[PDB]
Amino acid sequence: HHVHPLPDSVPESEDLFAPPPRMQGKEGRPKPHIGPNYESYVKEWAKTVGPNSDEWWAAKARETLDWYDDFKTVRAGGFEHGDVQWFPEGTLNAAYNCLDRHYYKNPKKTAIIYEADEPSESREVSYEELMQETCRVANVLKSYGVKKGDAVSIYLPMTWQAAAAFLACARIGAIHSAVFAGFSAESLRDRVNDCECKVLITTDEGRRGGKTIATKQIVDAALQQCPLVENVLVLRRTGNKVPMTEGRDKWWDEECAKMPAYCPCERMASEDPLFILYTSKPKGVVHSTAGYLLGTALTLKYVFDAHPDDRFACMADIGWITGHSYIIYGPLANGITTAVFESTPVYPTPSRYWDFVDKWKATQLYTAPTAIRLLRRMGEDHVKNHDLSSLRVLGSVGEPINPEAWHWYNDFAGKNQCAIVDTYWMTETGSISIAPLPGAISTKPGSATFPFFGMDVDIIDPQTGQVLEGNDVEGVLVARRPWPSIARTVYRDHKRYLETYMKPYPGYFFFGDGAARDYDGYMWIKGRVDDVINVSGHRLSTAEVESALILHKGVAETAVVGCADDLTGQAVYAFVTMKPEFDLKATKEADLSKELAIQVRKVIGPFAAPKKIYLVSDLPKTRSGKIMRRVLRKIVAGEGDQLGDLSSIADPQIVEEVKQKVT
Amino acid sequence: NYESYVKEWAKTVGPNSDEWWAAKARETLDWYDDFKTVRAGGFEHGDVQWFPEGTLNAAYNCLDRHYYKNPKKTAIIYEADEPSESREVSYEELMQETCRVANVLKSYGVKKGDAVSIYLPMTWQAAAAFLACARIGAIHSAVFAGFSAESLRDRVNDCECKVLITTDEGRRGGKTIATKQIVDAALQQCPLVENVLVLRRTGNKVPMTEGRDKWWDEECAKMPAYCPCERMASEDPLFILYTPKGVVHSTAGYLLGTALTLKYVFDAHPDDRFACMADIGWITGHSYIIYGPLANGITTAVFESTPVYPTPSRYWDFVDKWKATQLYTAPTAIRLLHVKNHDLSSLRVLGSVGEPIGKNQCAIVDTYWMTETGSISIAPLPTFPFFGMDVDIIDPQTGQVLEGNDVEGVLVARRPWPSIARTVYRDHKRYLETYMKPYPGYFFFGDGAARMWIK
Amino acid sequence: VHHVHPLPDSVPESEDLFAPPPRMQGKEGRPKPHIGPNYESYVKEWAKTVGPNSDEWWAAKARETLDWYDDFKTVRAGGFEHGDVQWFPEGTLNAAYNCLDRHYYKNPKKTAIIYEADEPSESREVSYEELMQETCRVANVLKSYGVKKGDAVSIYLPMTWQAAAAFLACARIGAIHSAVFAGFSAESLRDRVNDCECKVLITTDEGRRGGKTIATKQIVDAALQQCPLVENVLVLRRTGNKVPMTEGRDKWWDEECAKMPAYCPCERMASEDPLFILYTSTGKPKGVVHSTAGYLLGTALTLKYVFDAHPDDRFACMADIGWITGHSYIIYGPLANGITTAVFESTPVYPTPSRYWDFVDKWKATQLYTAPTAIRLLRRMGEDHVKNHDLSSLRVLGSVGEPINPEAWHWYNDFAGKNQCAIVDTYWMTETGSISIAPLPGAISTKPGSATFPFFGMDVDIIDPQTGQVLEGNDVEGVLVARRPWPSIARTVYRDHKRYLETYMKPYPGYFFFGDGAARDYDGYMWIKGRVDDVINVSGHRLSTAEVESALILHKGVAETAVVGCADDLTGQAVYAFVTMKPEFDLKATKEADLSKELAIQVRKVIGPFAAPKKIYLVSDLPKTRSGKIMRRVLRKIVAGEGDQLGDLSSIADPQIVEEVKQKVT
Numbered sequence A: 001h002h003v004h005p006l007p008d009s010v011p012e013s014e015d016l017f018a019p020p021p022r023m024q025g026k027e028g029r030p031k032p033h034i035g036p037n038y039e040s041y042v043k044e045w046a047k048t049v050g051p052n053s054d055e056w057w058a059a060k061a062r063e064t065l066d067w068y069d070d071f072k073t074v075r076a077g078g079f080e081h082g083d084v085q086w087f088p089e090g091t092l093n094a095a096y097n098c099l100d101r102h103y104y105k106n107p108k109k110t111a112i113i114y115e116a117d118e119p120s121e122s123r124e125v126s127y128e129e130l131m132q133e134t135c136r137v138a139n140v141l142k143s144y145g146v147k148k149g150d151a152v153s154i155y156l157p158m159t160w161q162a163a164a165a166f167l168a169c170a171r172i173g174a175i176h177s178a179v180f181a182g183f184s185a186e187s188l189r190d191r192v193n194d195c196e197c198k199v200l201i202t203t204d205e206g207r208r209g210g211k212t213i214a215t216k217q218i219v220d221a222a223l224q225q226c227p228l229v230e231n232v233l234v235l236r237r238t239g240n241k242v243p244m245t246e247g248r249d250k251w252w253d254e255e256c257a258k259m260p261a262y263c264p265c266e267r268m269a270s271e272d273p274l275f276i277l278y279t280s281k282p283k284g285v286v287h288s289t290a291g292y293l294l295g296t297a298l299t300l301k302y303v304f305d306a307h308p309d310d311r312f313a314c315m316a317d318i319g320w321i322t323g324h325s326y327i328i329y330g331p332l333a334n335g336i337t338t339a340v341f342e343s344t345p346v347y348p349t350p351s352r353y354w355d356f357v358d359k360w361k362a363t364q365l366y367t368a369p370t371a372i373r374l375l376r377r378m379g380e381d382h383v384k385n386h387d388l389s390s391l392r393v394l395g396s397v398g399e400p401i402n403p404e405a406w407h408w409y410n411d412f413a414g415k416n417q418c419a420i421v422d423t424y425w426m427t428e429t430g431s432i433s434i435a436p437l438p439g440a441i442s443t444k445p446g447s448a449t450f451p452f453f454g455m456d457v458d459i460i461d462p463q464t465g466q467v468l469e470g471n472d473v474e475g476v477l478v479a480r481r482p483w484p485s486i487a488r489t490v491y492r493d494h495k496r497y498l499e500t501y502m503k504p505y506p507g508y509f510f511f512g513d514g515a516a517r518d519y520d521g522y523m524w525i526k527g528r529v530d531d532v533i534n535v536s537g538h539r540l541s542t543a544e545v546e547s548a549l550i551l552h553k554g555v556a557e558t559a560v561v562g563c564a565d566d567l568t569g570q571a572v573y574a575f576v577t578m579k580p581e582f583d584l585k586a587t588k589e590a591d592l593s594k595e596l597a598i599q600v601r602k603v604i605g606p607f608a609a610p611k612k613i614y615l616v617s618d619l620p621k622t623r624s625g626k627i628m629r630r631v632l633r634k635i636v637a638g639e640g641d642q643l644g645d646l647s648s649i650a651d652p653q654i655v656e657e658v659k660q661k662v663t
Numbered sequence B: 001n002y003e004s005y006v007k008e009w010a011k012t013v014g015p016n017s018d019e020w021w022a023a024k025a026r027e028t029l030d031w032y033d034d035f036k037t038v039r040a041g042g043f044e045h046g047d048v049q050w051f052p053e054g055t056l057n058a059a060y061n062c063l064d065r066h067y068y069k070n071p072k073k074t075a076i077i078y079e080a081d082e083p084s085e086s087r088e089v090s091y092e093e094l095m096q097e098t099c100r101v102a103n104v105l106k107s108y109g110v111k112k113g114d115a116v117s118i119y120l121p122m123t124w125q126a127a128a129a130f131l132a133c134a135r136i137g138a139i140h141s142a143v144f145a146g147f148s149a150e151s152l153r154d155r156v157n158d159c160e161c162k163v164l165i166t167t168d169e170g171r172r173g174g175k176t177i178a179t180k181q182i183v184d185a186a187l188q189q190c191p192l193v194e195n196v197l198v199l200r201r202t203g204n205k206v207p208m209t210e211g212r213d214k215w216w217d218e219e220c221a222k223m224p225a226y227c228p229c230e231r232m233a234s235e236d237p238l239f240i241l242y243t244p245k246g247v248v249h250s251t252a253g254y255l256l257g258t259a260l261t262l263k264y265v266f267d268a269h270p271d272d273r274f275a276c277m278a279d280i281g282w283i284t285g286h287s288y289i290i291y292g293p294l295a296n297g298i299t300t301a302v303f304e305s306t307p308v309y310p311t312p313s314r315y316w317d318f319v320d321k322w323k324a325t326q327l328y329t330a331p332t333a334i335r336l337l338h339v340k341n342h343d344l345s346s347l348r349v350l351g352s353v354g355e356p357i358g359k360n361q362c363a364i365v366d367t368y369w370m371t372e373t374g375s376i377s378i379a380p381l382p383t384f385p386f387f388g389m390d391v392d393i394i395d396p397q398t399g400q401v402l403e404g405n406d407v408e409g410v411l412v413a414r415r416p417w418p419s420i421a422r423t424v425y426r427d428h429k430r431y432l433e434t435y436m437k438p439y440p441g442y443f444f445f446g447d448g449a450a451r452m453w454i455k
Numbered sequence C: 001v002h003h004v005h006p007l008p009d010s011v012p013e014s015e016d017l018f019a020p021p022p023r024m025q026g027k028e029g030r031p032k033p034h035i036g037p038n039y040e041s042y043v044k045e046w047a048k049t050v051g052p053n054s055d056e057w058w059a060a061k062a063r064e065t066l067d068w069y070d071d072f073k074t075v076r077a078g079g080f081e082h083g084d085v086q087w088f089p090e091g092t093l094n095a096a097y098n099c100l101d102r103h104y105y106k107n108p109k110k111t112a113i114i115y116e117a118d119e120p121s122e123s124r125e126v127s128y129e130e131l132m133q134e135t136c137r138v139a140n141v142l143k144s145y146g147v148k149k150g151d152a153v154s155i156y157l158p159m160t161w162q163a164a165a166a167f168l169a170c171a172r173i174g175a176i177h178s179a180v181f182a183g184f185s186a187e188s189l190r191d192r193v194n195d196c197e198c199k200v201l202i203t204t205d206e207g208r209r210g211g212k213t214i215a216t217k218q219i220v221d222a223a224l225q226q227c228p229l230v231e232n233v234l235v236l237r238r239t240g241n242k243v244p245m246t247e248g249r250d251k252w253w254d255e256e257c258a259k260m261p262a263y264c265p266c267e268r269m270a271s272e273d274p275l276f277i278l279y280t281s282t283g284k285p286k287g288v289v290h291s292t293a294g295y296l297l298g299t300a301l302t303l304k305y306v307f308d309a310h311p312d313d314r315f316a317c318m319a320d321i322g323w324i325t326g327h328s329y330i331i332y333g334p335l336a337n338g339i340t341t342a343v344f345e346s347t348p349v350y351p352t353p354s355r356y357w358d359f360v361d362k363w364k365a366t367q368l369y370t371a372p373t374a375i376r377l378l379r380r381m382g383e384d385h386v387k388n389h390d391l392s393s394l395r396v397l398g399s400v401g402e403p404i405n406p407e408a409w410h411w412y413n414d415f416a417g418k419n420q421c422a423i424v425d426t427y428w429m430t431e432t433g434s435i436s437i438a439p440l441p442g443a444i445s446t447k448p449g450s451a452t453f454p455f456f457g458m459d460v461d462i463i464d465p466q467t468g469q470v471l472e473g474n475d476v477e478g479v480l481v482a483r484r485p486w487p488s489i490a491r492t493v494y495r496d497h498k499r500y501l502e503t504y505m506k507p508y509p510g511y512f513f514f515g516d517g518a519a520r521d522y523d524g525y526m527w528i529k530g531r532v533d534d535v536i537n538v539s540g541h542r543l544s545t546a547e548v549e550s551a552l553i554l555h556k557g558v559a560e561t562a563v564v565g566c567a568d569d570l571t572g573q574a575v576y577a578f579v580t581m582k583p584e585f586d587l588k589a590t591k592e593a594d595l596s597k598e599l600a601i602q603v604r605k606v607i608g609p610f611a612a613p614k615k616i617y618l619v620s621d622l623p624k625t626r627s628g629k630i631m632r633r634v635l636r637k638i639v640a641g642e643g644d645q646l647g648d649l650s651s652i653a654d655p656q657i658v659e660e661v662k663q664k665v666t
Ligand SMILES: CC(C)OP(=O)(O)OC[C@H]1O[C@@H](n2cnc3c(N)ncnc32)[C@H](O)[C@@H]1O
Pocket: A279, A321, A322, A396, A397, A398, A399, A400, A401, A422, A423, A424, A425, A426, A427, A428, A448, A511, A512, A513, A525, A526, A527, A528, A624
């Protein structure tokens, strides 16, 4: 075969994982929405793509969401000019679908499990309570002159009221723009200025992992350079003294106390913007309303097999698209219970996730490979002595999951009784693009497997621009047709949207990731196109080399970048982090580096073996867990003085250590 | 009989009452969009909801739909302060004037959800001013024309309106109210008011501030006599009424309440001539001069005078002149009133309201309610709680209901009703503390009662 | 014999009735007419559209013709007296959705606009997809400026195809566009920009017309010096030549639109929400306001029936979008019907007088719609420019703007139509929204110079202006009035409803007053013969301008004429005639004094002794508006010695012509 699976210590013949009994309708669990095999996935998927898929999408849109006005047209527009339309004539409101309609059915049902930074302060928030808070905030925003179509910046940490702030904007047709709490004043300023908002919602302080985030202090520094912001609504999360500017700044509780606990919903067109979400100039990805909401609702239902009484635990942050789609919009649109997790995976101890799961009997868990590798690094004593049997689906999002970490997830979090859904997508796709349906698909460690409903993906040969038909092909991932939750533009920069996604391969949407489809038709997304390394004509994905390195005992996490080489074009350079227990005296660093290189050579080939290996205490990462290989690539290339605004990455101090180790 | 008012009332209260209420809302009002949910929310947090997904317009229900059916029908019997100056105002004329004023307001930049203060005496154009605001989704705040400059200022400032509708002068009991003079005094300390629309009721010289002040007639003459109706959510606010606390009523529930009570408590019929002698500056004039009668498409009276001008026979002269079919007044006026040789036979119902209190023919209906209730809550049907009203007696010393008959305590309501006030403008905390906290789970009217007798 | 006579013609009356020709009979593979084949087929359908039982027809047509977001309940209400006309009031819709989206969803690649550039070689087809995308981009730009539903937006654009996108972007978001003829003076632009109180103006750097540059941005800058409310100007880069741009206020159309997505939601408009203000040229500028559903329905129905438009037709209205004709029969009517419409950027004589016909044969136009002034202009230029063309794709030729003299009607019929097209003489006004009286080409046998019969929904009569009373029967003459509102009637004059009532509704209470003299002949055909204010009363004989001007043009060498009245001690008024001759006419073989005698004799033979002009002035051209109306008021006041009280003539087609006329009279 030309395409190989991501390196794994398990033989390929023993590495296929059928839906386990918890996902077979056994063990008293709900029967899966799609099952029990691959063909059941294909039979339904075939209804969602192609020239006769309007019927399926029209029915799903009308069955899944409540509409004030019906639509007539299912879809129109396309990539070339960026005029994608779905259900254009219909009207709806996201807050109505995420709150009102469920409150009218079961007001006391839990909407949010609020897992506070300190475990003792966690509590359940009913749909009634969440709706009331959302309506109060919406009324406050209207009193500030916020109109349909106005942008509102949100700089809130992971307290449950973040959901109320999102949905209060959606309720009145405002466009919320959420910024990770803890982003520097500079990063906040750039995003507040770009969306041209006049109102900002924030906290006095945030709490995360027992640390205080001085949000109001950061807001005050940023707003000195944000001339349009005239109103700041400040949630009293900690109660510590913070500055408050007379007139501009008001307290959330004092303002909401003046307002009624119900607010009508603004009737939104399907294509009215729902939010702007900046990714790392800052790129404001814009999603509209109906198509995005439908995509998050359908993917949540089908990829995680969500049922009415499920308790869904997405442990990400609402500053990330993962939090937009699979904390707030998806779970609440489905009317189930969703977790707002305010802490870190290791506060107070690395048992936190699992204490949380057993306390609330979470039925699905969704996190990132960085968190899985972090907990794997800390040892099994924190997870082994838990129940965790309420879980039946474990999800991974953010980057390729190394098969080694996949197995740890499968073995310890799931006890070999959960389906693992490796979900590939992007901020720009709105909802999950490629993922196993857990009641249907037998999984391979490291493979997203098959495309979701409405996603028709192909592999293009970047040297020819042509689609590679069939299986056992490798290249760059593209999508053939629009899908309902695709981002509609980049805020006030449609040209950047067209040039980034629609022009590289005309006729297609360009994801920016390298991908392969193996002989069984499974899709493998193996890293960013910009991270590919070419050694003596061999094209290397980051995931395959990083997956080989972690097979060595004691390795916690690695990142590989290319460095120019006069004789091989590029050479692989690897940054490697070891588990805390690994003794760098019994195995001197030079001996360990040799073993790591040998391991890569045996599993991939000599061309992939790192020419140099740097042992570091940690890797530069974004708040969401992405490993910033561009930073490492520029440091190795001697361009460490031209890196840009890294002030809001997870730990800026790590960039200095890496610079020292390389020098 | 008892088995008639109680048989029907059982369908309007309790866990099976949504069916009755959905049918009446759909029979009684014209809707642009249908509702799905009948009711939601409750007293505790003040999130009462009725017909939330529906859309409608109060001006469409009080003017347009009747104008389309019978444009020449009299909407308002305008009984001027001088009896000789009275005249009938047709639904066509009222709708045209309402639309002109609505177009004037839009030309000032009044948007859906904006407050507009109204400082008008009892001339028929007061209805046009109310319904013009409702037509465009503005929130009118009516201020009784007998209020001083300070009381006017306080209410104008509290609601943050940018527009005020008033008159040059008012005429009541043969005397002149210097309304524009009072308005100018008030507006010296009202920094948000940018436009004043001044109805020329007397034509006597009054001060007018260039730019800020314009004449009603001259502004309306520039505008077309039709204006589209803003499609309002059932729970969009309809008006603020300061009682200073701004009692806020929403649209669909309030309008349904007034229309049903008017039809049942007063047994209205399509060609009736309903004469409520109250003032549009108070809820009685809101509900049973303007919104109740015009929603039903009947004829309503706008009485500009006093009970004793020119003489104490004025009420009975008015009833004989117009053949009024109902007469709704307070005991205060009915006691102050010269009634011997009058006919008064056209009257089918004599209503009383506002305080504890025909000659063998016209009925006597004693109606209890409050500004916060929107429409009549307890009354006899020609006593007995109205449809949707489930009231109980509670001992204040225990907070417990005094089940039975011969008990005495405070009056409370069990569940929300459609026309209940939804908040106190920008002071929801006061709304909850006043009405919802004294007896958790109940609505606290604030008066005593015993069995039903209202103390 | 008859009291009412046809407009003077050299063809005998018995040979002057033209039945629908074979191209309009469903033969030769042409589409079958929507109404046909005779007068009775028109009456049978027309009778459903007027009277007390016509709600059914109008409700069905409104629901069949337009896409609605919300249905209506009431068909019509209101009336003339107070100006509260309402049609389909409870319904909601959007004009851009009906003109773009619904057709784009059906056939995105169908041509929406044939853009005939000033230079023929630069012309191209603009698909519904491209037009919708550009409309959506502009709509998004306007929203980014804070334009809200109900805000006015001024448009000062020449006849480039993007003018349609600018109109429809305003309609898409519920803004009220106010389009001003490109080339109007800074003073005229200022007055209209200030009256509508807009805060946004859309224009070009420059326009191109007849090989000439229109300094649109320079004019805008001059005007905006006196327009304190305008905060944003969007400038279309039509030529790319250097023009001033004010930092902050002014932005380039292409740079702004490139930032925006190519789709924009449609604002759900009430039937009676204003769609546009259109200013017309005697006092202050008159902003005629049209609402949405009735206007759109009227333009859609008249286009379909008066021009017998079918799905694949290529409709060529050669007017300007600054004129109501361009509003209704370039943009809204044709695009609502989903067909192809022409945006003609040039003049009838650039590069040569063959332009119209080169255009028709190049694009295979199926209908042509222009004005008598253009027809008379091409007539004066000779037959070599039209004779050697095909023109067989045409089957309907339309004329709008003024009475068409039978002499010009025949030239149109003979050379443009080759006696195989139906001629539709369409009478209406800015204030009527859509065509009011016109032949239905598959049904009505035409008379040269007659509008013939009223359109669906139009119930018209003749009032004797000397009595104020309706004249019953046929063979009557007086002033035209309408008995009942129709869906596309103007709803007000912007912020001046009193002027609307006093101009149209007060002169003849109970009726709508058009302001034109009219006659209904013995066959019931309607003749619109000139403005009431232009009637000339000589010794008790009331003379219409059209009849005398039609008699004069029967003389060899006459190109165009205008007659006005001047007080006369012996006849009350006397006829004075301003005459333009063809360039080739030898004015020395026939001296000016000699020609006048022949003209007077011809008018006497054809009309009567009283109609002979008392004085005749030879002029090189006549004062005319941009749209072709002859400004007889200007001539009338000059003859009356009142040339110093003429008003704002800065924006007429040729202001210099007024100076010559003053000289000739002096
Ligand atoms: C949802 C959230 C992660 O979106 P973004 O923050 O916009 O980042 C999107 C980018 O992340 C990477 N990626 C995310 N998931 C996976 C996965 N399962 N397998 C492989 N690569 C994955 C890709 O490079 C993608 O372009």
